[PDB]
Design a protein around this ligand. Structure first.
Ligand code: HEC
Ligand SMILES: [C-]#N
Ligand SMILES: [K+]
Ligand SMILES: [Xe]
Ligand SMILES: [Xe]
Ligand SMILES: [Xe]
Ligand SMILES: [Xe]
Length: 128
């Protein structure tokens, strides 16, 4: 709880400052409308239950951004290993994320802050 967290004098999480759970659901719908609309990335999600993924991804980003909700998915290295995902691909994905965040009116300093929280994860997402 935001209020309870501030009662304990803990610093505001990225999760809170952008609107917690529901802000993230909304971004994630847009995000995937943008990823699935992109011809360089579409194919990747050909054999995928998107509803299941969106659910899993709301959990991951929420978790990653400071939320109290649990990730109930597979590890990042494993799911992405062998899918031929390159940095070129990682970055385009990181683009739609940002556009989606921007479109949700999230300030750019905070978008840039989320990107720098996700970026490291590339090591686990790409091949090289
Ligand atoms: C364009 C390729 C691509 C990029 C870039 C990528 N992923 Fe994914 N990822 C996939 C695909 C495809 C799946 C679904 C595979 C399946 O259907 O089982 C997936 C699955 C996932 C899942 C759910 C895993 C599960 O347990 O089902 C999460 C969470 C996730 N990715 C997060 C991320 C995060 C966080 C990043 C960036 C830091 C990222 N992905 C970058 C292609 C990508
Ligand atoms: C991203 N899945
Ligand atoms: K895999
Ligand atoms: Xe997000
Ligand atoms: Xe996302
Ligand atoms: Xe992402
Ligand atoms: Xe980044």
């Amino acid at each position: 709880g935001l209020l309870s967290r501030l009662r304990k004098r803990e610093p505001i999480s990225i999760y809170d400052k952008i609107g917690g759970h529901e802000a993230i659901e909304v971004v994630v719908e847009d995000f995937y409308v943008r990823v699935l609309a992109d011809d360089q990335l579409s194919a990747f999600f050909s054999g995928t239950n998107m509803s299941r993924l969106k659910g899993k991804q709301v959990e991951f980003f929420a978790a990653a951004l400071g939320g109290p909700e649990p990730y109930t998915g597979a590890p990042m290295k494993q799911v992405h290993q062998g899918r031929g995902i390159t940095m070129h691909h990682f970055s385009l994905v990181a683009g739609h994320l940002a556009d989606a965040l921007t479109a949700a009116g999230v300030p750019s300093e905070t978008i840039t802050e989320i990107l720098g929280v996700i970026a490291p994860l590339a090591v686990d997402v790409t091949s090289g």
